Amino acid sequence: YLPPVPVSKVVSTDEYVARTNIYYHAGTSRLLAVGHPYFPIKKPNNNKILVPKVSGLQYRVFRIHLPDPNKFGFPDTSFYNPDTQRLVWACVGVEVGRGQPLGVGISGHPLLNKLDDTENASAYAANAGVDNRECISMDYKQTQLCLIGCKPPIGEHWGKGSPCTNVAVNPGDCPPLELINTVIQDGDMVDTGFGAMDFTTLQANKSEVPLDICTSICKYPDYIKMVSEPYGDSLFFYLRREQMFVRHLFNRAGAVGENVPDDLYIKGSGSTANLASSNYFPTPSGSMVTSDAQIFNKPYWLQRAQGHNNGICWGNQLFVTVVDTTRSTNMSLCAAISTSETTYKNTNFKEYLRHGEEYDLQFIFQLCKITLTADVMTYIHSMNSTILEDWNFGLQPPPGGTLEDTYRFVTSQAIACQKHTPPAPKEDPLKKYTFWEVNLKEKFSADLDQFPLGRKFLLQAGLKAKPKF
Amino acid sequence: KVVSTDEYVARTNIYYHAGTSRLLAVGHPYFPIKKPNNNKILVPKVSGLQYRVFRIHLPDPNKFGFPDTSFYNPDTQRLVWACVGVEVGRGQPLGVGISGHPLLNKLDDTENASAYAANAGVDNRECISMDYKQTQLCLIGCKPPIGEHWGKGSPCTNVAVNPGDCPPLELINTVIQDGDMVDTGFGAMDFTTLQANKSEVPLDICTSICKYPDYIKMVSEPYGDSLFFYLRREQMFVRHLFNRAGAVGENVPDDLYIKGSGSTANLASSNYFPTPSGSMVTSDAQIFNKPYWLQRAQGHNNGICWGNQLFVTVVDTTRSTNMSLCAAISTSETTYKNTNFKEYLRHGEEYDLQFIFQLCKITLTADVMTYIHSMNSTILEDWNFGLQPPPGGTLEDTYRFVTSQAIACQKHTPPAPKEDPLKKYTFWEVNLKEKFSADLDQFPLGRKFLLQAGLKAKPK
Amino acid sequence: YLPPVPVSKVVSTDEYVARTNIYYHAGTSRLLAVGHPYFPIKKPNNNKILVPK
User: Fold this and answer.
1) Breaks in chain B (C–N > 2.5 Å) following residue
2) Is the dihedral of CA B396, B400, B405, B410 positive or negative?
3) Is A391 exposed, middle or buried (0-12, 13-18, 19+ CB in 10 A)?
4) Where does the UniProt annotation locate this protein (chain B)?
5) 3-state secondary structure at position B263
6) Distance (Å, rounded) from C-alpha A456 to C-alpha A297?
7) CA distance B131 to B205
């Protein structure tokens, strides 16, 4: 059993693609965002947000549009036929600026299910009352990551599905679990070390974790399935560093789901008449932060990636996703409602919390062309045909079929006839999925020398750009 | 006089690969679920602390005949895989579990006391949890893993043994399986056997025998095929210092010391146990999920593999975190009460494997027909040139039975589908057979090697 | 669009500059400073600083 030949066995893009002599760059001025860490702000009666909830622990999603090269002429355009061929951008090198002085922020919760210290106890604990929840906080696991590719990052999380039907679920049963892939959206939350899942559905208490994550589903990237892709065009590249260690050890307090079989221990008495809660959970503790482990503010250079794409960005479209813990510092300020009285009082001062956010992007690019034959056309048409649309061969145009001449009938609409609304803006299927946006379309330049970053590109390849006089 | 495999070995030029789907895995930290009256388990306790062991199931290469069969005689030789290469998927962000016991024998701290302790209530057991030795490992080779661990020795009849005496002492050396007990270094053994108390330890570690490799004897295989490879890494030390409280085994000679009185008359705990501290973690500490390689190994085996069959094992602390649920049997009431919340747990688990391989071809001489036959004959069992021409032509049909006069009534004989001898040993199993295929162009990884190869990538 | 040619070049200094054979050095003797960390010192009635912070 071979069994047959045709596969067709996806190939290295670098086969048919050709690299040009020309490079460009453009970059944003910069980006900044302000928001409150813990919850968003809205008018109490209204649903309209007064202030957006923002914190470092929110993921960042950057979508970047490029103008069509093939709209864009050249100083000398003769070197190719624009008819028989196309032009496509390629991404050689990338940078992430981050400017904040580095420092750690933090979160907590006013009410948290807890028993007491498990580390050292002179005597057995007390009786469980109602609601012993306390106000305690902790630091999240320190982390850095970066993500690059033309297809959105694929997330995964734990989640609840439908139990197979034999036993009718009664209230209080253990809901079965499901592993679920999904697209990644902005504002979503890093793991705290509690794992990607839905607290909202799976945690009823709503008090089991600090605020920020209670609402949403923390998610985490699966390199496997992602990297698994046949085209690899999800992500062609990435880096990561993170670390954690223990600090404290506590107990849940609540109704016991199940008791250990006795045979695993021996009956107590008196103080030991009853068994304390079995539960335990750690308190994650971030560590010493260093300037070194910083992965940013340093250039990157790509040639070969695990995927067959080499820096190809189809559809003038490009994705970057990055998350940092290091700048999480939260400044806190105070306003005085009364400036007169000279006796200090806790009454006079309201408190507010805001968090700074600092990004920048600068992207190298390379220029490339594509010859057309059928095998060509075929091969693409297999991969993603939508791509074709924005290109023009030729169209197909329709060997794939034609519209039957929509009915246009002259009516004031006051005639007894139906509505008609002139159609078709939508170019993005993913418009369902919101996230942070930037447009570059205008910013390109053809001379590296003028930019801080680029000259390194030169330096890496040397080669005086020819400023002689 | 064992020799390298590759003495006789005859290579191919040719390679295939497979990689799993992945690993779907989960389950409860502490103990498995079953109907209370019953022994029938609802749901497994699942832990990292359960030893992590997986094993290989593959087609005979000789099964596939070739577009070009030409190059060899199937008969005058055999045709035998080698492993070229290996990779594990390991995907979870890394995590912390942690534990201890709700009852514990302890007296108290050592370090800090302003005064000697008070009197001992009986059954003073307490609830504390701990961390662990911080560790990963990976284990690579074809013969069964076997852990060696303590035992209670054999009391000979010389000393008449007295109620409560010391069990004599042993190291036990015994086959490894999946889902077995990591140590924190509390001794490689079963207290459940070897500790009366049953109040001494983390529940989980109450269960069963801590186990740890024997390189040395696995080092000591004649062929070194249990594994030809592994890696081993960890970090830890102690956190705190705490006294047990229990009836005296034995006491200290006075000459070693001086005498107190009153308060000071009375014995300070000789029961002394530390409280460990497992450390911080880092990305860089990750050993996982990276191109994994050999050529030469300590053993004669190089990729020398049998039954189309191999054993795989690895362990990691790093991800040990679970997560629980707060189950509100009533959502109705809007005012808070601890009442309403049951709690459940499982530990979700994940992996994958992608591995590169070669085949090799083997002609036949006595050495061949013997040295391994010598070494082990089980493969030529699997081959047909083990011979055995038999006798035995004839018998008699007699029919029919149903006639109700009675000729002896008959045959029992499925009897021996049984082939895995060690089959009663029970542990994880992975059949791979038909996942193989040619080109790493298609296969997400070892084209890593193919670039590590290089070689021109071939046209279209 | 096509990008126009309305620009200069701003150039590496090493273009027009010329390096010589000669070198020199000088350095301070040393610097010394003393002060109070937490606040500056001044005469209570005056605004004139008694000690620099």
Assistant:
1) none
2) positive
3) middle
4) Virion; Host nucleus
5) helix
6) 13
7) 13
Q: Which residue spans within B395-438 are E strands per DSSP?
A: 430-431
Contact A204, A106 (CB under 8 A): no
- The CA distance from A116 to B128, in Å, is 11
Amino acid, res. B320? S
Cα distance between residue A324 and residue A239, in whole Å = 12
Structure tokens at B204: 């989980």
Structure tokens at A264: 């695993």
CB atoms inside a 10 Å sphere around CB A294: 15
What radius of gyration, in Å, describes the C-alpha atoms of chain A? 29
Q: Are A135 and A281 in contact (CB under 8 A)?
A: no
Method: cryo-EM
Say which residues have a Cβ less than 8 Å from residue B303's Cβ, sequence separation at least 6.
B81, B82, B83, B84, B294, B357, B358
Find where tokens 């070892």 sit: B446
Q: Tokens representing A371? A: 């010859």
Q: How many C-beta neighbours within 10 Å does residue A36 have? A: 18
Question: Which candidate, A38, A16, A149, A269, places its Cα nearest to that of B122?
Answer: A269
Would you list the DSSP string of A201-244? HHBSSS-SS-HHHHHSB--EE-HHHHHH-SS--S-SEEEEEEEE
How many other CB atoms are found less than 10 A from the CB of residue B89? 24
Peptide bond into B226 cis (omega under 30): no
Chain C residues close to A447, C-beta within 8 Å: 7, 9
Please tell me if residue A43 touches chain C, with a CB cutoff of 8 Å.
no
- Distance, CA of A35 to CA of A33 (rounded, Å): 7
Q: What are the chain A neighbours of C8 within 8 Å (beta carbons)?
A: none
Which helix (DSSP H) or strand (DSSP E) does residue B100 occupy?
A: strand B99-101
Structure tokens at A294: 């910083």
Is-contact B203 B99, C-beta < 8 A?
yes
User: Contact B80/B59 with Cβ under 8 angstroms?
Assistant: no
Query: Distance, in angstroms, between C15 CA and closest chain A CA?
Result: 7
How far, in Å, CA of B245 to CA of B266, rounded? Answer: 14
Resolution in A: 4.7
Give me the phi and psi of A200, to 5 degrees please: -50, -55
Distance of CA A331 to the CA centre of its chain: 25
Contact A142, A326 (CB under 8 A): yes
Q: Where are the alpha helices (DSSP H) in B341-420?
A: 366-367, 373-375, 378-382
User: In A, which residues are within 8 Å of C11 by CB distance?
Assistant: 449, 467
Strand partners, A282: A249
**Cα distance between residue B246 and residue B125, in whole Å:** 11
Residue B363, beta-bridge partner list: B77
Kind and range of the H or E element at A251? Answer: none
Q: Say yes or no for a CB contact (<8 Å) between B324 and A225.
A: no
Query: How far apart (Å, rounded) are the C-alpha atoms in residues B333 and A130?
Result: 15
Cis amide prior to B213 (ω within 30 degrees)? no
Compute the distance between CA of residue A260 and CA of residue A280 in angstroms, rounded to an integer.
15
CA distance B182 to B377: 35
Test A242 with B444 for CB contact under 8 angstroms.
no
**C45 Cα to chain A: minimum distance (Å):** 21
Helix, strand, coil content of chain C in percent (nearest 5): 0, 10, 90
d(CA A113, CA A277): 12
Distances (CA, A) of B457 to A12, A230, A399: 9, 17, 35
Beta strands in A36-153 (DSSP E): 41-42, 49-51, 60-65, 86-90, 94-97, 107-109, 136-138, 142-149
Q: Using CA atoms, how far apart are residues B358 and B155, in angstroms rounded to an integer?
A: 52
Distance CA A383, CA A159 (A): 31
What is the Rg, in whole angstroms, of the alpha carbon atoms belonging to chain C?
Answer: 27
Q: How does DSSP classify residue B226?
A: S
